[PDB]
Amino acid sequence: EARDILKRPVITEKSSEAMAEDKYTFDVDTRVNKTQVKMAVEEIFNVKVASVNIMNYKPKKKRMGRYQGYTNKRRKAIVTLKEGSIDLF
Amino acid sequence: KAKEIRDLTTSEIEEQIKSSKEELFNLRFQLATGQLEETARIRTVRKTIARLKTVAREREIEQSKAN
Amino acid sequence: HIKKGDNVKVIAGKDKGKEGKVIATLPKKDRVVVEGVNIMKKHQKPTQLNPEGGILETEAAIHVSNVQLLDPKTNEPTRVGYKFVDGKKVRIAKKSGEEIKSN
Amino acid sequence: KQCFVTGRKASTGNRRSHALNSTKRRWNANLQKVRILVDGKPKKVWVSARALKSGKVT
RNA sequence: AGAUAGAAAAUAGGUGCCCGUACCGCAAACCGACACAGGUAGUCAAGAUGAGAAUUCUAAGGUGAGCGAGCGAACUCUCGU
RNA sequence: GAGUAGCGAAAGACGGGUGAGAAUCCCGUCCACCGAUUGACUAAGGUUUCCAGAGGAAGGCUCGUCCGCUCUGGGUUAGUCGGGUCCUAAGCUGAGGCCGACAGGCGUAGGCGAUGGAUAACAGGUUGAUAUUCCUGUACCACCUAUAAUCGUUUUAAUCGA
RNA sequence: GCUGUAAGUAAGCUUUGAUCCAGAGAUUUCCGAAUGGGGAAACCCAGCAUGAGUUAUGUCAUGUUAUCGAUAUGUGAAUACAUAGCAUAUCAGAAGGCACACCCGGAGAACUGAAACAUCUUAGUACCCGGAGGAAGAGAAAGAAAAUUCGAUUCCCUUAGUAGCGGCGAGCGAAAUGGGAAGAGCCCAAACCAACAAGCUUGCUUGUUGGGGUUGUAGGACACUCUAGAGUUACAAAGGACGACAUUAGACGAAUCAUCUGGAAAGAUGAAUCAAAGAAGGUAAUAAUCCUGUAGUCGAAAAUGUUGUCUCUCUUGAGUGGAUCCUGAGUACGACGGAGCACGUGAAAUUCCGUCGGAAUCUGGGAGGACCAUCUCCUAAGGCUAAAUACUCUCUAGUGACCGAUAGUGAACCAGUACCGUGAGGGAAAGGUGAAAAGCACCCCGGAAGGGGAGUGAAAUAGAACCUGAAACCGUGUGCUU
């Protein structure tokens, strides 16, 4: 726990526009709350977060060849830390 | 490689599970950021954590059943 | 059945009465690639991995039913049996004594 | 709806006519509600009037 | 009714979770098998004329309709005399 | 049947550009239609059709360089908005109970259930896609901790309450 | 050698024994009887205890909390005891699913046949629900019968489409005998009992405490006299301890070479060989001798069915009198209405249900198709019971004058899927390049799709929509015609 919920970071144009500011973007597990996220990040990177925002993305249709599928459901969190710098190197 | 793990006391074993879980995080954070290259390290540490938890279960289950 | 690196003769195909050393086994289609056997002419296209290309002359696989080990003594095509030396299934040329498969 | 004691319960059969035309019918027990002694405490239950002919204590 | 030695007061610091949020919605994303002349609750709804949310033109703002180019016969359709 | 019927209400013209190809795509000027609406919102419903690049087989009643099409990569941020959280109507369920050939039906206490009642955030800026959600400004509602300027038998109080 | 399909390119792993294959174990999100409360399955929202976290609050983790049922404690009304009722604790107690089968019940059609139709038939069939069990039901004579006995039951063959029942219409239709498979028998109530044990006052009564003995040669107590094998499939009922084959991985396993044609031989030709193996499938064509195997033999750490025993656990066996006593009560049975018997209410036995009545106790009771008298047989009204028998969701091995892609499953292929319907439900179409992917390097026209060379291949009118490639149909030439 506190490391199993941060699945991956998100590197995209909108996330990096948010990295110009102190907002960092992560791909978190689908069964966590803002609280559980704040704690995990401030535990790992030793940062002090001010706020965090969460959104749930629906499974998207993906056709691979002749077989249709659906992508996995996602939950994304945006942090806006005041003290610190999550370095994604 | 579960011999020395049996040789290891139940304490730092739980700490080994802990450390390997940390490593795994770092590997998958770097696979995403596209700085990994050694993508098979993920499976070896998954092996390692799996064995470490199996040994941890065997450690507590002998005691539970026998006294 | 034969081994990964022994020397065998071929009895099927355009290649018969010819020796050569086995280079790969492929145990799920029962097919070996011997040396020189089945020379192929494959048209490889200029790509990124392969800068250019051409007509490669690689070797193709053949069914294990088309090759045979040679008697280490008399170099004659022979079957292969087994004997239990110290409980180990080691091989015999079936017309003479022990047959060595080290590489 | 059975008799608490015996078990006399209902049964199906036929109402037959003079032309032997048949319709389904039923035959119920003469079940009467009586307060008898059950499991110690008195209780009201259905009991047939043939079981009350001789043997039951109200 | 009970319950209890406690904080209200005139401050200063912190904490506030889960689900929905794109897009269409008098419509080529909806109900009509269709990029269908039908149906689809509610809110805002300007100027000139008027009694008016009528009527004609226009503002804000949208749009030129997923086939065309000719010739202007018969015969149908819509319209005027 | 036949290269026949049909091409699904309507105003287009022209200059420039793009391309293998242009009445049909992009830009511009003029013209025209709606305007208690073909305009702006928001529900129900549909779910990715949304945005940026790229493509042209197929789908678009023609063509197509175009698109609600295809490929790639992206996009939905709330203590205050609508719900959950609070309340209940019509109905639906219903422990025990009543009735029932079995199946089961009915029903009390109690629950569920908005189309209703009660509830604290406004303006401006902002990108290709979001914004009472993000940011700037200023607020408000609950909750907790430290402190309190003396409320004062802790029965009554500063005041705690079905 | 491996990293499934399923290709990939990239990191790896593996003789220090990987991937595999068997046995055992661990983990096993969420929903679902779903069970903490709710709910539009796969989601929300909690109480309690313990822990994590925080200065605290928020937050999190792990347990626990449904309803009946049984039992055990408390507490306890209208009411005085008491009884409801409440509250705890416990309990591998119950739920639900299914194989679209077989079995036993509850309840029960209709079309149809009668050349109409109502009795009748369809048919106690279909469909419903309730129980099951691997089998179930039945089962130790109140029997069959006229010699006596299948001496329990079931099932098969025959009796036999006979006897019979039938608006005597359409139809329906036995049983005994005899021939077989398989066979097995038992336990209780009652009397009585030294007692025991409570009531009630020790006079007795009643109890499960227990014994006792369960049967027609009439059995048992009784009184005599006498004497210490079973079995967990009924016959009480538990479980360690040794073996024995078999089954959920496997191992060994005989004997062929040459030429010819070929793209390749297993074919042809010649010469051999093995066979407890010439089952079968592969292999570049048709193989007993090339490969996987086959006959034969061998083989389990383990976890199972199974079985020999050794334990173990149980424990009375008879006779003779027969004075008394006992032998299954609202029962048999009768009446009424129905149902069941092959048997339609009939002369209607035999048998069951509802409703009223209602018996005998061996010096008795029931049956022998109205029936009786006599004879013969049996001994009800309590219980248990394996085998022969029915069926196949499975698993294992194998078989087929069964099907070969409009067939055979609806389904050879990501099929109960596209799709259709609000929903029950309905429900497709679609296999084949080659031996090997060798899947067409380059060049030429074209934006591309295509093509034309060159090359791969035996073959490319085998180039991926790919084996063979018919007909309808559409074209391009033309000899003879108009």
From Swiss-Prot, chain A:
SUPFAM superfamilies: Ribosomal proteins S24e, L23 and L15e. One of its GO terms (molecular function) is rRNA binding. Keywords: Ribonucleoprotein, Ribosomal protein, RNA-binding, rRNA-binding. It holds the Pfam family Ribosomal_L23. Gene3D superfamilies: 3.30.70.330. It comes from the Bacteria. One of its GO terms (biological process) is translation. InterPro entries: Nucleotide-bd_a/b_plait_sf, Ribosomal_uL23-like, Ribosomal_uL23/eL15/eS24_sf. One of its GO terms (cellular component) is ribosome. Belongs to the universal ribosomal protein uL23 family. Part of the 50S ribosomal subunit. Contacts protein L29, and trigger factor when it is bound to the ribosome. One of the early assembly proteins it binds 23S rRNA. One of the proteins that surrounds the polypeptide exit tunnel on the outside of the ribosome. Forms the main docking site for trigger factor binding to the ribosome. This is Large ribosomal subunit protein uL23. The lineage of its organism: Bacteria, Bacillati, Bacillota, Bacilli, Bacillales. The gene is rplW.
Swiss-Prot record, chain B:
InterPro entries: Ribosomal_protein_uL29, Ribosomal_uL29, Ribosomal_uL29_sf. Transmembrane segments: none annotated. It comes from the Bacteria. Keywords: Ribonucleoprotein, Ribosomal protein. GO terms for molecular function: structural constituent of ribosome. Pfam families: Ribosomal_L29. CDD domains: Ribosomal_L29_HIP. SUPFAM superfamilies: Ribosomal protein L29 (L29p). Gene3D superfamilies: 1.10.287.310. The keyword Cell wall biogenesis/degradation does not apply. GO terms for cellular component: cytosolic large ribosomal subunit. GO terms for biological process: translation. The keyword Ribosomal protein applies. Belongs to the universal ribosomal protein uL29 family. This is Large ribosomal subunit protein uL29. The gene is rpmC.
UniProtKB/Swiss-Prot annotation, chain C:
Belongs to the universal ribosomal protein uL24 family. GO terms for molecular function: rRNA binding; structural constituent of ribosome. This is Large ribosomal subunit protein uL24. Keywords: Ribonucleoprotein, Ribosomal protein, RNA-binding, rRNA-binding. InterPro entries: KOW, Rib_uL2_dom2, Ribosomal_uL24, Ribosomal_uL24_CS, Ribosomal_uL24_KOW, Translation_prot_SH3-like_sf. One of its GO terms (cellular component) is ribosome. The lineage of its organism: Bacteria, Bacillati, Bacillota, Bacilli, Bacillales. One of two assembly initiator proteins, it binds directly to the 5'-end of the 23S rRNA, where it nucleates assembly of the 50S subunit. HAMAP family: Ribosomal_uL24_B (MF_01326_B). The keyword Lipid metabolism does not apply.
From Swiss-Prot, chain D:
Residues 1-20 are annotated as: Disordered. Keywords: Ribonucleoprotein, Ribosomal protein. Gene3D superfamilies: Ribosomal protein L28/L24 (2.30.170.40). One of its GO terms (cellular component) is ribonucleoprotein complex. Belongs to the bacterial ribosomal protein bL28 family. GO terms for biological process: translation. GO terms for molecular function: structural constituent of ribosome. It comes from the Bacteria. This is Large ribosomal subunit protein bL28. The keyword Ribosomal protein applies.
